[PDB]
């Protein structure tokens, strides 16, 4: 009857599409969805699994591949079926996701294609997927001999639009020559874009801006925001479908489902 879903955040909206997809599958099969919000903390992720034990979940949907030490032990000791989301494991674990790195290299290559050569990176939160995003951006820049530590900005606090505007201020003061920003999440990109307009900066002519995820507000910016559509809803759908089968001792369609991504190319980079 019940499945536990563990996600690192509610506020940033990234995983709302994902909850909605799971529910579509769980409701159709009569399961109840329980939600654990770990706030990107492995300690609380643990405390949530422990605490949610008393609810007798039949299976668990887990975000990400990195987890606290005893985490995996509890899952096996209780023989709990699990599907992992957002990433791709290379060790048998059942998972649905896509290549964070390919995504990051792809959006970066798009910026290069637009004639930009001093492309910065805006990082916030700094979880595992953000850094994979970073690896792609770096690998794209290395191929073009355009890499520069002076154009990467990684800040540990949680993302927000205010923070996107603040990071923009810092980047353009340090490096007024920066001609594009790839932001690790749309909230940051949205803030940096609104701030850039406020500062009278021509976008994309002087500065192109791209985000990540294609959260709802991205298409509805002025100018519309270039970003990477990640299949967050389809990840929840596929992850649920596959866990249900695992609960019924069956073989899911795939043990490692790469749903890819699309580049959403808009005026904020294409003019």
mmCIF file of C-alpha atoms in Angstrom:
data_model
loop_
_atom_site.group_PDB
_atom_site.id
_atom_site.type_symbol
_atom_site.label_atom_id
_atom_site.label_comp_id
_atom_site.label_asym_id
_atom_site.label_seq_id
_atom_site.Cartn_x
_atom_site.Cartn_y
_atom_site.Cartn_z
ATOM 1 C CA UNK A 1 0.000 0.000 0.000
ATOM 2 C CA UNK A 2 2.791 2.490 0.785
ATOM 3 C CA UNK A 3 6.043 3.687 -0.779
ATOM 4 C CA UNK A 4 8.623 6.016 0.779
ATOM 5 C CA UNK A 5 10.021 8.750 -1.494
ATOM 6 C CA UNK A 6 13.212 10.539 -0.405
ATOM 7 C CA UNK A 7 14.093 13.912 -1.984
ATOM 8 C CA UNK A 8 16.717 16.518 -1.024
ATOM 9 C CA UNK A 9 14.401 19.523 -1.364
ATOM 10 C CA UNK A 10 10.872 20.874 -1.771
ATOM 11 C CA UNK A 11 11.552 24.600 -1.831
ATOM 12 C CA UNK A 12 13.738 24.676 -4.939
ATOM 13 C CA UNK A 13 10.863 23.006 -6.855
ATOM 14 C CA UNK A 14 13.248 20.734 -8.806
ATOM 15 C CA UNK A 15 11.550 17.557 -7.594
ATOM 16 C CA UNK A 16 7.891 18.569 -7.715
ATOM 17 C CA UNK A 17 7.643 17.223 -11.295
ATOM 18 C CA UNK A 18 9.118 14.007 -9.923
ATOM 19 C CA UNK A 19 6.640 13.637 -7.065
ATOM 20 C CA UNK A 20 3.809 14.217 -9.528
ATOM 21 C CA UNK A 21 5.046 11.451 -11.842
ATOM 22 C CA UNK A 22 5.425 8.900 -9.044
ATOM 23 C CA UNK A 23 1.936 9.650 -7.717
ATOM 24 C CA UNK A 24 0.511 9.080 -11.214
ATOM 25 C CA UNK A 25 1.865 5.535 -11.005
ATOM 26 C CA UNK A 26 1.244 4.959 -7.278
ATOM 27 C CA UNK A 27 -2.351 6.196 -7.391
ATOM 28 C CA UNK A 28 -3.096 3.996 -10.392
ATOM 29 C CA UNK A 29 -1.802 1.032 -8.363
ATOM 30 C CA UNK A 30 -3.356 2.024 -5.049
ATOM 31 C CA UNK A 31 -0.206 2.941 -3.161
ATOM 32 C CA UNK A 32 0.170 5.771 -0.661
ATOM 33 C CA UNK A 33 3.117 8.133 -1.089
ATOM 34 C CA UNK A 34 5.134 9.202 1.944
ATOM 35 C CA UNK A 35 7.554 12.112 1.528
ATOM 36 C CA UNK A 36 10.923 12.541 3.246
ATOM 37 C CA UNK A 37 12.725 15.851 2.697
ATOM 38 C CA UNK A 38 16.424 15.455 3.557
ATOM 39 C CA UNK A 39 17.461 19.081 2.860
ATOM 40 C CA UNK A 40 20.560 17.785 1.021
ATOM 41 C CA UNK A 41 21.753 16.295 4.326
ATOM 42 C CA UNK A 42 22.800 12.633 4.515
ATOM 43 C CA UNK A 43 22.330 12.652 8.287
ATOM 44 C CA UNK A 44 18.676 13.650 8.060
ATOM 45 C CA UNK A 45 18.241 11.303 5.103
ATOM 46 C CA UNK A 46 19.221 8.532 7.510
ATOM 47 C CA UNK A 47 16.987 9.791 10.340
ATOM 48 C CA UNK A 48 14.099 9.822 7.857
ATOM 49 C CA UNK A 49 14.572 6.221 6.767
ATOM 50 C CA UNK A 50 14.776 5.130 10.406
ATOM 51 C CA UNK A 51 11.755 7.203 11.421
ATOM 52 C CA UNK A 52 9.707 6.178 8.372
ATOM 53 C CA UNK A 53 10.294 2.513 9.176
ATOM 54 C CA UNK A 54 7.322 2.560 11.559
ATOM 55 C CA UNK A 55 5.123 3.191 8.504
ATOM 56 C CA UNK A 56 5.944 -0.177 6.980
ATOM 57 C CA UNK A 57 6.788 1.049 3.458
ATOM 58 C CA UNK A 58 6.820 -1.706 0.837
ATOM 59 C CA UNK A 59 9.520 0.024 -1.229
ATOM 60 C CA UNK A 60 11.733 3.109 -1.392
ATOM 61 C CA UNK A 61 12.411 5.708 -4.085
ATOM 62 C CA UNK A 62 15.751 7.410 -3.363
ATOM 63 C CA UNK A 63 17.284 10.539 -4.904
ATOM 64 C CA UNK A 64 20.972 10.319 -5.743
ATOM 65 C CA UNK A 65 23.628 7.645 -5.289
ATOM 66 C CA UNK A 66 25.604 9.163 -2.417
ATOM 67 C CA UNK A 67 24.273 8.157 1.028
ATOM 68 C CA UNK A 68 25.310 7.975 4.690
ATOM 69 C CA UNK A 69 27.396 5.010 5.854
ATOM 70 C CA UNK A 70 24.784 2.738 7.504
ATOM 71 C CA UNK A 71 22.088 3.740 4.977
ATOM 72 C CA UNK A 72 22.607 0.796 2.620
ATOM 73 C CA UNK A 73 22.730 -1.617 5.578
ATOM 74 C CA UNK A 74 19.283 -0.688 6.875
ATOM 75 C CA UNK A 75 17.797 -1.116 3.407
ATOM 76 C CA UNK A 76 19.159 -4.654 3.075
ATOM 77 C CA UNK A 77 18.584 -5.684 6.705
ATOM 78 C CA UNK A 78 14.921 -4.904 6.100
ATOM 79 C CA UNK A 79 15.022 -6.350 2.581
ATOM 80 C CA UNK A 80 13.498 -3.118 1.223
ATOM 81 C CA UNK A 81 13.270 -2.861 -2.601
ATOM 82 C CA UNK A 82 14.714 0.429 -3.909
ATOM 83 C CA UNK A 83 14.957 2.470 -7.092
ATOM 84 C CA UNK A 84 17.435 5.368 -7.264
ATOM 85 C CA UNK A 85 16.661 8.627 -9.069
ATOM 86 C CA UNK A 86 18.380 11.444 -10.988
ATOM 87 C CA UNK A 87 21.701 9.609 -11.469
ATOM 88 C CA UNK A 88 23.015 6.424 -13.060
ATOM 89 C CA UNK A 89 24.739 3.826 -10.918
ATOM 90 C CA UNK A 90 27.386 1.583 -12.426
ATOM 91 C CA UNK A 91 27.193 -1.124 -9.764
ATOM 92 C CA UNK A 92 23.892 -2.930 -10.280
ATOM 93 C CA UNK A 93 21.655 -0.634 -8.213
ATOM 94 C CA UNK A 94 18.336 -0.004 -9.936
ATOM 95 C CA UNK A 95 18.115 3.579 -11.171
ATOM 96 C CA UNK A 96 16.493 6.083 -13.518
ATOM 97 C CA UNK A 97 18.233 9.272 -14.571
ATOM 98 C CA UNK A 98 20.550 10.812 -17.111
ATOM 99 C CA UNK A 99 24.092 12.055 -17.575
ATOM 100 C CA UNK A 100 24.630 15.180 -15.507
ATOM 101 C CA UNK A 101 27.994 15.598 -17.233
ATOM 102 C CA UNK A 102 26.760 15.221 -20.827
ATOM 103 C CA UNK A 103 24.037 17.722 -19.995
ATOM 104 C CA UNK A 104 26.600 20.196 -18.631
ATOM 105 C CA UNK A 105 28.950 19.758 -21.604
ATOM 106 C CA UNK A 106 26.004 20.129 -24.001
ATOM 107 C CA UNK A 107 24.714 23.459 -22.654
ATOM 108 C CA UNK A 108 28.290 24.746 -22.491
ATOM 109 C CA UNK A 109 28.927 23.710 -26.109
ATOM 110 C CA UNK A 110 25.779 25.598 -27.041
ATOM 111 C CA UNK A 111 27.216 28.745 -25.450
ATOM 112 C CA UNK A 112 30.470 28.240 -27.385
ATOM 113 C CA UNK A 113 28.400 27.801 -30.553
ATOM 114 C CA UNK A 114 27.017 31.300 -29.859
ATOM 115 C CA UNK A 115 30.488 32.817 -30.117
ATOM 116 C CA UNK A 116 31.075 33.057 -26.360
ATOM 117 C CA UNK A 117 34.621 32.337 -25.139
ATOM 118 C CA UNK A 118 34.677 33.506 -21.525
ATOM 119 C CA UNK A 119 31.962 31.304 -20.069
ATOM 120 C CA UNK A 120 31.535 31.296 -16.285
ATOM 121 C CA UNK A 121 29.899 28.686 -14.086
ATOM 122 C CA UNK A 122 27.522 29.523 -11.244
ATOM 123 C CA UNK A 123 27.397 26.785 -8.616
ATOM 124 C CA UNK A 124 25.297 26.644 -5.451
ATOM 125 C CA UNK A 125 24.625 23.888 -2.895
ATOM 126 C CA UNK A 126 27.463 21.817 -4.413
ATOM 127 C CA UNK A 127 25.905 18.375 -4.124
ATOM 128 C CA UNK A 128 27.142 15.506 -6.314
ATOM 129 C CA UNK A 129 25.070 16.309 -9.432
ATOM 130 C CA UNK A 130 26.078 19.990 -9.480
ATOM 131 C CA UNK A 131 29.754 18.913 -9.573
ATOM 132 C CA UNK A 132 29.070 16.422 -12.382
ATOM 133 C CA UNK A 133 27.424 19.334 -14.226
ATOM 134 C CA UNK A 134 30.648 21.214 -13.550
ATOM 135 C CA UNK A 135 32.783 18.374 -14.967
ATOM 136 C CA UNK A 136 30.866 18.579 -18.264
ATOM 137 C CA UNK A 137 31.196 22.346 -18.512
ATOM 138 C CA UNK A 138 34.940 21.892 -17.855
ATOM 139 C CA UNK A 139 35.341 19.090 -20.393
ATOM 140 C CA UNK A 140 33.628 21.233 -23.032
ATOM 141 C CA UNK A 141 35.887 24.194 -22.251
ATOM 142 C CA UNK A 142 39.061 22.063 -22.219
ATOM 143 C CA UNK A 143 38.340 20.906 -25.791
ATOM 144 C CA UNK A 144 38.193 24.571 -26.819
ATOM 145 C CA UNK A 145 41.138 25.588 -24.638
ATOM 146 C CA UNK A 146 38.744 28.044 -22.914
ATOM 147 C CA UNK A 147 38.927 26.751 -19.337
ATOM 148 C CA UNK A 148 39.636 29.217 -16.518
ATOM 149 C CA UNK A 149 39.469 28.798 -12.734
ATOM 150 C CA UNK A 150 38.808 32.536 -12.586
ATOM 151 C CA UNK A 151 35.422 31.869 -14.235
ATOM 152 C CA UNK A 152 34.095 29.236 -11.832
ATOM 153 C CA UNK A 153 32.081 30.291 -8.806
ATOM 154 C CA UNK A 154 31.004 27.639 -6.322
ATOM 155 C CA UNK A 155 29.070 28.781 -3.251
ATOM 156 C CA UNK A 156 27.951 26.292 -0.550
ATOM 157 C CA UNK A 157 24.624 27.897 0.386
ATOM 158 C CA UNK A 158 21.249 26.762 -1.033
ATOM 159 C CA UNK A 159 20.302 28.216 -4.395
ATOM 160 C CA UNK A 160 17.884 31.095 -4.824
ATOM 161 C CA UNK A 161 17.131 33.898 -7.251
ATOM 162 C CA UNK A 162 18.592 36.535 -4.899
ATOM 163 C CA UNK A 163 21.771 34.496 -4.848
ATOM 164 C CA UNK A 164 21.846 34.420 -8.668
ATOM 165 C CA UNK A 165 21.760 38.212 -8.709
ATOM 166 C CA UNK A 166 24.487 38.418 -6.010
ATOM 167 C CA UNK A 167 26.744 35.931 -7.844
ATOM 168 C CA UNK A 168 26.269 37.970 -11.033
ATOM 169 C CA UNK A 169 27.446 41.125 -9.209
ATOM 170 C CA UNK A 170 30.580 39.319 -7.954
ATOM 171 C CA UNK A 171 31.367 37.666 -11.341
ATOM 172 C CA UNK A 172 31.059 40.867 -13.377
ATOM 173 C CA UNK A 173 33.180 42.832 -10.872
ATOM 174 C CA UNK A 174 35.943 40.245 -10.795
ATOM 175 C CA UNK A 175 35.671 39.494 -14.529
ATOM 176 C CA UNK A 176 33.830 42.191 -16.523
ATOM 177 C CA UNK A 177 34.970 40.298 -19.657
ATOM 178 C CA UNK A 178 32.778 37.262 -18.854
ATOM 179 C CA UNK A 179 30.514 36.777 -21.884
ATOM 180 C CA UNK A 180 28.276 33.922 -20.795
ATOM 181 C CA UNK A 181 27.144 32.190 -17.624
ATOM 182 C CA UNK A 182 26.035 28.582 -17.260
ATOM 183 C CA UNK A 183 24.131 28.418 -13.943
ATOM 184 C CA UNK A 184 23.722 25.019 -12.266
ATOM 185 C CA UNK A 185 19.979 25.604 -11.645
ATOM 186 C CA UNK A 186 17.294 27.905 -13.100
ATOM 187 C CA UNK A 187 16.636 29.890 -9.908
ATOM 188 C CA UNK A 188 20.200 31.240 -10.088
ATOM 189 C CA UNK A 189 19.873 31.924 -13.838
ATOM 190 C CA UNK A 190 16.585 33.730 -13.350
ATOM 191 C CA UNK A 191 18.131 35.991 -10.697
ATOM 192 C CA UNK A 192 21.254 36.664 -12.733
ATOM 193 C CA UNK A 193 19.139 37.461 -15.822
ATOM 194 C CA UNK A 194 16.820 39.882 -13.995
ATOM 195 C CA UNK A 195 19.851 41.476 -12.355
ATOM 196 C CA UNK A 196 21.695 41.815 -15.661
ATOM 197 C CA UNK A 197 18.668 43.619 -17.150
ATOM 198 C CA UNK A 198 18.507 45.889 -14.117
ATOM 199 C CA UNK A 199 22.198 46.715 -14.729
ATOM 200 C CA UNK A 200 21.524 47.560 -18.382
ATOM 201 C CA UNK A 201 23.546 44.605 -19.726
ATOM 202 C CA UNK A 202 22.674 43.421 -23.247
ATOM 203 C CA UNK A 203 21.641 39.775 -23.300
ATOM 204 C CA UNK A 204 22.858 37.794 -25.150
ATOM 205 C CA UNK A 205 24.879 40.410 -27.055
ATOM 206 C CA UNK A 206 27.265 41.186 -24.218
ATOM 207 C CA UNK A 207 26.321 38.324 -21.908
ATOM 208 C CA UNK A 208 24.472 35.130 -22.655
ATOM 209 C CA UNK A 209 22.772 33.259 -19.797
ATOM 210 C CA UNK A 210 21.734 29.608 -19.524
ATOM 211 C CA UNK A 211 20.233 27.693 -16.615
ATOM 212 C CA UNK A 212 19.502 24.053 -15.807
ATOM 213 C CA UNK A 213 16.417 21.837 -15.359
ATOM 214 C CA UNK A 214 13.852 23.944 -17.195
ATOM 215 C CA UNK A 215 11.806 24.744 -14.093
ATOM 216 C CA UNK A 216 8.390 26.283 -14.883
ATOM 217 C CA UNK A 217 9.480 29.962 -14.633
ATOM 218 C CA UNK A 218 12.307 29.598 -17.176
ATOM 219 C CA UNK A 219 10.153 29.831 -20.288
ATOM 220 C CA UNK A 220 8.303 32.717 -18.670
ATOM 221 C CA UNK A 221 11.202 35.122 -18.198
ATOM 222 C CA UNK A 222 11.928 38.199 -20.247
ATOM 223 C CA UNK A 223 13.942 37.336 -22.193
ATOM 224 C CA UNK A 224 12.894 33.661 -22.088
ATOM 225 C CA UNK A 225 15.628 31.607 -20.363
ATOM 226 C CA UNK A 226 17.843 29.110 -22.160
ATOM 227 C CA UNK A 227 18.186 25.970 -20.044
ATOM 228 C CA UNK A 228 18.378 22.174 -20.024
ATOM 229 C CA UNK A 229 15.103 20.289 -19.749
ATOM 230 C CA UNK A 230 15.687 17.364 -17.421
ATOM 231 C CA UNK A 231 13.001 14.636 -17.519
ATOM 232 C CA UNK A 232 12.266 14.927 -13.803
ATOM 233 C CA UNK A 233 8.623 13.855 -14.187
ATOM 234 C CA UNK A 234 9.442 10.895 -16.440
ATOM 235 C CA UNK A 235 12.091 9.878 -13.926
ATOM 236 C CA UNK A 236 9.414 9.669 -11.216
ATOM 237 C CA UNK A 237 7.059 7.732 -13.507
ATOM 238 C CA UNK A 238 9.719 5.244 -14.627
ATOM 239 C CA UNK A 239 11.123 4.917 -11.092
ATOM 240 C CA UNK A 240 7.711 4.062 -9.658
ATOM 241 C CA UNK A 241 6.806 1.619 -12.457
ATOM 242 C CA UNK A 242 10.096 -0.187 -11.871
ATOM 243 C CA UNK A 243 9.779 -0.317 -8.063
ATOM 244 C CA UNK A 244 6.258 -1.756 -8.242
ATOM 245 C CA UNK A 245 7.657 -4.560 -10.391
ATOM 246 C CA UNK A 246 10.539 -5.124 -7.982
ATOM 247 C CA UNK A 247 8.021 -5.391 -5.139
ATOM 248 C CA UNK A 248 6.157 -8.019 -7.175
ATOM 249 C CA UNK A 249 9.488 -9.792 -7.614
ATOM 250 C CA UNK A 250 9.802 -8.980 -11.312
ATOM 251 C CA UNK A 251 12.494 -7.697 -13.673
ATOM 252 C CA UNK A 252 12.032 -3.984 -14.438
ATOM 253 C CA UNK A 253 12.306 -2.886 -18.079
ATOM 254 C CA UNK A 254 15.817 -1.605 -17.291
ATOM 255 C CA UNK A 255 18.078 -1.704 -14.244
ATOM 256 C CA UNK A 256 19.703 1.499 -15.515
ATOM 257 C CA UNK A 257 17.335 3.769 -17.449
ATOM 258 C CA UNK A 258 19.001 6.767 -19.123
ATOM 259 C CA UNK A 259 16.141 9.087 -20.102
ATOM 260 C CA UNK A 260 18.495 11.722 -21.561
ATOM 261 C CA UNK A 261 17.791 15.467 -21.668
ATOM 262 C CA UNK A 262 16.886 18.228 -24.151
ATOM 263 C CA UNK A 263 18.438 21.622 -24.651
ATOM 264 C CA UNK A 264 15.728 24.311 -24.480
ATOM 265 C CA UNK A 265 17.207 27.076 -26.595
ATOM 266 C CA UNK A 266 15.719 30.510 -25.974
ATOM 267 C CA UNK A 267 16.311 34.235 -26.354
ATOM 268 C CA UNK A 268 18.547 34.595 -23.279
ATOM 269 C CA UNK A 269 21.315 32.898 -25.303
ATOM 270 C CA UNK A 270 20.060 33.132 -28.892
ATOM 271 C CA UNK A 271 18.780 36.712 -29.023
#
